[PDB]
Design a protein around this ligand. Structure first.
Ligand SMILES: Nc1ncnc2c1ncn2[C@@H]1O[C@H](COP(=O)(O)OP(=O)(O)OP(=O)(O)O)[C@@H](O)[C@H]1O
Ligand SMILES: Nc1ncnc2c1ncn2[C@@H]1O[C@H](COP(=O)(O)OP(=O)(O)OP(=O)(O)O)[C@@H](O)[C@H]1O
Ligand SMILES: Nc1ncnc2c1ncn2[C@@H]1O[C@H](COP(=O)(O)OP(=O)(O)O)[C@@H](O)[C@H]1O
Ligand SMILES: [Mg+2]
Ligand SMILES: [Mg+2]
Lengths: 1030, 103
């Protein structure tokens, strides 16, 4: 409930009291102590996690007033405090107890601590100075015990709970690089640190924008009047307290270009912001793109100046959403609200921001509106998602005045007149993040040091938009293409716009166009595009015409198609290029960003025109690190999950692990991952019972569920694109398996930094080829190596899919190795079956498609590209002589490696027993003879039938038993009883008694399937292969 | 495995999915198939002879897709292939891939 809050100075921890009205309602005999939770209406879009509190009764506190130790957030008491807060008691004494806590201590205090003789004395020392009482003090994560000298690093498992000196595990650390020096309370210094200065000069201060909309409730002054939030600005109690009063009616902010006005309020205690600065909403920042602040000043302006104006002009300000036809009805309607719902103060030549949203259009509010004023309710349902500017261009003062400025408008008399379109460059992002203020679906923000392509594109546009137009500018034309889709080039272009304030005209071909009628005319597309550009390009400059999925309109000349279609193709291609040139030459500042799903398909007639096309590779782990931190950011999760309590991770996740473990080939839509994580977390939360023995305060994501989600995502992506998994049990990381392992390790290491520092510049990188009899280790080795030392195992798995009738096989293999280069630490396993055809290079299957395939494969197999490339090639063949050394030549697949021989000690009866253990085994099967009845050189692969056929034999015996049973009963009860009916009715839990014994196994072995390859084949290939490998 | 399904339902660990017959001509194995087709009561799909192939480009792939789709969508059945060589020769081919893509 609503509660007034105050701050005391009673030790670092103390059960601070509350008013008796609240206390007596819950501090009854059912508990010896009162516990609850406190809630501060802090700034920001959502809200922070709440904090536990311990209370005792007190009669000195007035109606519904609460006290807390001012330090608990770490600021001075003199600072303006809460007007109100939320409090709620913990019912049924359900107070959690923490399992472990971590502490960070300084050198002197830590030494003094451990120098104590015994554990009990150390616990008492912890107890005394910190006033922490066991089973009665609730502590939280990241709590600073004392300013700049010690801190509690974290708590587990819960964010907040009680501490037991003999059950809660206390961990202490000191380290050496002195984090603690910077870990001081927020009140780093006293209020009087800043020297006093009188009413001398302007003393203006820098200008910065708010992070979010400011709620009306937290205001310390009385918002008595219906001022429409129009000019409020905030400061951190400095540069204003020096003045006579902090509640000035009006403040001028500047008159560098032309004058503007603001109102100032002191920022309240727990804020987080840059020190000693002014904060204003976007409407104020609009007038000051250059961050001039020249003369902020206060004067006795009074309550009113120029209370009336007539025929106030308003005008359009260009841009895509302003000009589009669909929205005009609602958007003009909404203007009448903005200008009529409440009082506001305008300036000459000023900008008003107004929100227009979510296609909430053709949804007429009502047939009539004369009878009531009820617009405010709708806002509870209209969450905004887009903004347009309107420009007043003027002031229409009719009387005499000092200057035609700083004038009030009156809803009763101040009628409005619209006029034709005007241009004005929007704000750049680094000047003010417009989106966050209005809670829009915020576009991504890159750091320009880590992403190459955005830096390139943005600089190329930046040099053009204004840097060069002062002279004469080369018309800009840039095309974005990527080997893979969803890679965020629309986000690139939108970010470019937001960073440079350049208007963006996003013409997405799919939705905007109406093509594929394949009528006898292309004039529709031409007129549509040209008209829409024409409507907006004048008075919107600089502009970015962005054609998305351009390849739907412009595409290659498939001259094998029927005539009278290709003629439309020519028509459209040429005419489009005509519009290209027309825009570039007729208008100043056209740039035409394009995006294409695959570059080749753009016809040559059009490809040449553009310059410096950008390849947009999929993000590497260094980028992934920043995009996980973006999606998992503080209030991206919270944005629309309107549930009772916000969401966060707050601890324990390791972005390097997430980035490395399997985020390779998750090129974008990590949103899927993070949303699945949110899902698991929220489900685990809501399923909690009301009593449950415990209650979770907020949703917390854990790294285990995130790993689960990434595995799930990779599995569900597997259907879309083939992706190996780890379905292996009890057969992994056998470092000592064989002598071969050392060579594997000593050849896999050199091209990698962490095993071998050398860059392998001149040194030849090579793959690994295994050779020998099939069925004895060629696959498990690969998975083992990949998952233990390498990271990715995106094997070919499809070489047999050689080619279509089109000669695309070369492109196919190129794409295979491009997928290889994606998720750079990847090892490609070659099945080595049919795409490795050439025995002699000139005699097999005419040397056709496959000969080109093999030529390309050997050409690209290792071009000494780069160590950082990470592409390793592993394969498994019966014979290296199976090939003509085209791709087996030294330098590629070199360091040929032998599979080895198991016959010395086959170490597989154990594996047989372990596998069969899942099946009934305790029937004398365990003994050795079952394996020893066959020569010790027995094939390993045969066991996986030996077991199966044995089981089948068992099932046969039991089956003949029941075949007896049924007959018997048919003789006893009736011959007409169906077998299925009988076996259903007389069914028993003992049906699973699938009798199995040694004799079953021996019968199965001697009956059928001697082996896959046992007689002589294996032996002589083994010996010959070992001999020729020297 | 249909007659004694509670015996066969449990223990999915190991199994064999199909069987291959071959022998001298006239040794009843077609008649074995026929009898197994009719007395067993299990559904039986008779793709006798290399009817799988089709004139148009890569129609064989789609044909096999349809065949297996019908097999799955019909309740448990036997896909009967005879003169298997006619539909699955060795890997090597000088001709188009329309005769080996099928394999
Ligand atoms: N760097 C990024 N950070 C966060 N989200 C991103 C990023 N890149 C892409 N996205 C996500 O993907 C979207 C951008 O790609 P989108 O699918 O809209 O178009 P596109 O990249 O042109 O793709 P396609 O060509 O396949 O249609 C964003 O709206 C966001 O949801
Ligand atoms: N159990 C049996 N043993 C021997 N002959 C049988 C048996 N059952 C039926 N026959 C008769 O002998 C023939 C067995 O050979 P059949 O014609 O079925 O061979 P097939 O499997 O079609 O041979 P292929 O494809 O090599 O020509 C049957 O067509 C039938 O006339
Ligand atoms: N020395 C070994 N190294 C790795 N796996 C082995 C070994 N011996 C037996 N195995 C097991 O049996 C299989 C050995 O042959 P495998 O690598 O599968 O070749 P193939 O694919 O020709 O059957 C492995 O999959 C593994 O499960
Ligand atoms: Mg796109
Ligand atoms: Mg026959």
């Amino acid at each position: 409930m609503k509660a007034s809050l105050t701050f005391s100075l009673s030790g670092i921890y103390a059960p601070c009291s509350i008013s008796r009205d609240i206390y007596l309602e819950y501090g009854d005999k059912k508990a010896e102590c009162l516990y609850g939770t406190i809630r501060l209406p802090q700034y920001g879009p959502g809200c922070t996690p709440g904090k536990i509190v311990h209370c005792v009764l007190d009669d000195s506190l007035p109606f519904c007033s609460i006290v807390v130790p001012s330090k608990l957030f770490g600021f001075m008491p003199t600072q303006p405090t809460m007007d109100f807060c939320y409090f709620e008691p913990i019912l049924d004494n359900v107070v959690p107890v923490l399992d472990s806590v971590t502490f960070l201590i300084n050198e002197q205090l830590y030494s003094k601590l451990m120098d104590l003789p015994q554990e009990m004395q150390q616990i008492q020392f912890l107890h005394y100075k910190y006033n922490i009482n066991s089973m009665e003090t609730v502590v939280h994560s990241r709590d600073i015990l004392t300013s700049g000298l010690c801190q509690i690093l974290n708590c587990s498992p819960f964010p907040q709970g009680l501490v037991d000196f003999t059950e809660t595990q206390l961990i202490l650390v000191n380290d050496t690089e002195q984090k603690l020096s910077a870990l001081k309370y927020a009140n780093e210094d006293e209020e009087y640190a800043l020297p006093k200065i009188g009413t001398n000069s302007a003393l203006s201060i820098d200008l910065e924008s708010l992070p979010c909309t400011i709620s009306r409730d937290l205001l310390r002054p009385a918002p008595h009047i219906n001022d429409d939030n129009s000019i409020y600005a905030f400061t951190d109690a400095e540069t204003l307290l020096r003045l006579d009063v902090t509640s000035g009616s009006f403040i001028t902010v500047s008159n560098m270009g032309c004058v503007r006005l603001v109102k100032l309020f002191v920022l309240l205690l727990p804020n987080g912001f840059k020190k000693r600065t002014i904060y204003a909403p976007p409407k104020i920042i609009a007038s000051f793109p250059d961050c001039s602040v020249v003369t902020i000043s206060k004067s006795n302006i009074g309550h009113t100046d120029i209370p009336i104006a007539n025929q106030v002009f308003i005008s359009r300000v260009g841009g895509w959403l302003q000009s589009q036809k669909c929205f005009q009805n609602i958007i003009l309607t909404t203007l009448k609200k903005f200008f009529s719902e409440s009082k506001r103060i305008l300036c000459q030549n000023d900008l008003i921001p107004i929100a227009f949203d979510s296609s909430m259009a053709d949804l007429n509010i009502a047939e009539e509106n004369d009878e009531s004023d009820d617009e405010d309710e709708l806002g509870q349902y209209y969450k905004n998602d887009s903004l347009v500017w309107f420009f007043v261009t003027s002031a229409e003062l009719d009387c005499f005045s000092k200057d035609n400025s700083h004038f009030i408008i009156d809803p009763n008399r101040t009628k409005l007149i619209t006029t034709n379109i005007t241009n004005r460059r929007p704000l750049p992002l680094s000047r003010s993040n417009l989106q966050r203020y209005y809670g829009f679906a915020e576009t991504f923000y890159y750091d320009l040091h880590i992403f190459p392509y955005v830096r390139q594109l943005v600089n190329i546009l930046e040099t053009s938009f204004n840097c060069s137009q002062r002279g004469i500018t080369l018309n800009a034309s840039v095309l974005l293409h990527s080997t893979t889709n969803n890679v965020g080039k629309a986000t690139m272009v939108r970010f470019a716009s937001k960073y440079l304030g350049i208007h963006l005209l996003e013409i997405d071909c799919l939705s905007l166009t109406s093509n594929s009628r394949q009528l006898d005319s292309t004039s529709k597309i031409i007129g549509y595009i040209r008209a829409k550009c024409e409507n907006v390009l004048p008075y919107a400059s600089p502009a970015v015409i962005f054609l998305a999925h351009l390849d739907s309109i412009l595409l290659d000349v498939n001259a094998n198609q029927d005539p009278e279609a290709i003629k439309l193709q020519k028509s459209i291609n040429f005419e489009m290029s005509k519009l290209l040139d027309d825009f570039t030459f007729k208008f100043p500042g056209t740039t035409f960003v394009g995006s294409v799903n695959n570059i080749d398909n753009v016809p040559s007639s059009f490809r040449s025109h553009m310059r410096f096309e950008i390849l947009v590779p999929v993000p590497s782990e260094a980028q992934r690190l920043r995009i996980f931190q973006w999606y998992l950011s503080s209030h991206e999760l919270n944005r629309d999950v309107q549930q009772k309590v916000p969401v966060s991770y707050m601890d324990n996740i390791s972005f390097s692990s997430l980035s490395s473990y399997s985020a390779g080939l998750t090129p974008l839509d990590i949103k899927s991952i993070v949303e699945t994580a949110r899902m698991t977390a929220t489900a685990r939360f809501y399923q909690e019972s009301k009593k449950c023995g415990w209650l979770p305060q907020s949703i917390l994501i854990t790294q285990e569920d995130l790993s689960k989600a990434t595995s799930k995502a990779r599995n569900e992506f597997s259907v879309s694109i083939g992706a190996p998994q780890i379905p292996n049990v009890t057969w992994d990381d056998i470092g000592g398996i064989d002598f071969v392992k050392g060579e594997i390790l000593d050849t896999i290491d050199m091209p990698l930094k962490h095993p071998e520092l050398f860059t392998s510049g001149m040194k030849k990188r090579s793959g690994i080829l295994f050779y020998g009899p099939p069925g004895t280790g060629k696959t498990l080795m690969a998975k083992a190596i990949a998952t233990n030392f390498s990271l990715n195992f995106f094997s070919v798995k499809g070489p047999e899919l050689l080619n279509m009738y089109i000669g695309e096989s070369e492109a196919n293999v190129r794409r295979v190795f491009q997928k290889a280069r994606e998720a750079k630490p990847c090892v490609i396993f070659f099945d080595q079956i049919d795409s490795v055809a050439p025995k002699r290079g000139n005699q097999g299957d005419s040397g056709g498609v496959m000969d080109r395939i093999v030529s390309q494969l050997l050409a690209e197999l290792d071009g000494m590209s780069t160590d950082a490339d990470g592409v390793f090639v592993i394969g498994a063949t019966n014979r290296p002589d199976l090939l003509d050394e085209a791709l087996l030549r030294p330098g590629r697949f070199d360091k040929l490696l032998y599979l080895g021989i198991p016959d010395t000690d086959t170490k597989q009866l154990n594996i047989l027993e372990a596998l069969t253990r899942k099946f009934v085994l305790d029937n004398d099967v365990k003994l050795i003879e079952l394996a020893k009845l066959c020569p010790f050189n027995y094939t390993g692969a045969d066991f996986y039938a030996l077991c199966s056929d044995a089981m089948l034999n068992a099932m046969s015996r039991i089956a003949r038993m029941v075949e007896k049973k049924v007959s018997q009963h048919n003789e006893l009860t009736g011959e007409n009883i169906s077998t299925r009916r009988w076996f259903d009715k007389i069914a028993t839990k003992e049906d699973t008694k699938v009798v199995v014994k040694m004799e079953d196994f021996l019968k199965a072995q001697e009956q059928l399937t001697p082996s896959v390859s046992r007689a002589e084949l294996n032996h002589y290939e083994a010996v010959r292969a070992n001999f020729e490998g020297a | 495995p249909t007659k004694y399904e509670p015996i066969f339902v449990n223990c999915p660990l190991r199994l064999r999915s199909g069987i291959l017959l071959y022998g001298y001509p006239g040794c009843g194995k077609t008649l074995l198939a026929s009898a197994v087709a009719q007395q067993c009561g299990l559904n039986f799909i008779s793709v006798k002879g290399p009817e799988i192939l089709n004139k148009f480009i890569g129609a064989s792939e789609q044909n096999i897709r349809e065949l297996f789709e019908r097999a799955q969508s019909v309740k448990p059945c036997i896909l009967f292939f005879d003169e298997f060589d006619s539909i699955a020769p060795k890997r090597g081919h000088d001709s188009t891939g329309v005769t080996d893509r099928v394999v």
